[PDB]
Amino acid sequence: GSSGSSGFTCPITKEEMKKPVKNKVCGHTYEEDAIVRMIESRQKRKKKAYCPQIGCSHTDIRKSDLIQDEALRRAIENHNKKRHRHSESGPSSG
Numbered sequence: 573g574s575s576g577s578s579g580f581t582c583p584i585t586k587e588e589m590k591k592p593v594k595n596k597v598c599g600h601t602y603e604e605d606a607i608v609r610m611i612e613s614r615q616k617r618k619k620k621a622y623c624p625q626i627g628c629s630h631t632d633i634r635k636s637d638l639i640q641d642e643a644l645r646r647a648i649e650n651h652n653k654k655r656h657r658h659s660e661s662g663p664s665s666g
């Protein structure tokens with residue numbers, strides 16, 4: 573599986589990811605708010621959470637099989653540290 577050499581985009585929200593969550597069933601990775609808003613948006617519509625990753629065949633995802641991937645977490649931070657978007661925040665308490 574390969575999408576981008578440098579960067580992480582959620583196939584659902586279609587935006588940068590900050591909290592990558594890996595599944596125990598399949599293994600793919602998605603955004604927290606994404607996998608959280610999806611499962612809640614599906615159930616309410618009498619639906620099921622399926623691998624949103626365009627290309628997968630699986631269609632069985634459970635909130636219980638959702639974990640916080642560290643290997644990916646520290647990775648994303650490695651790019652964010654670069655600081656090339658805002659670079660203008662002087663908070664009194666950090």
Ligand SMILES: [Zn+2]
Pocket residue numbers: 598599600623625628629630
């Ligand atoms: Zn998958």
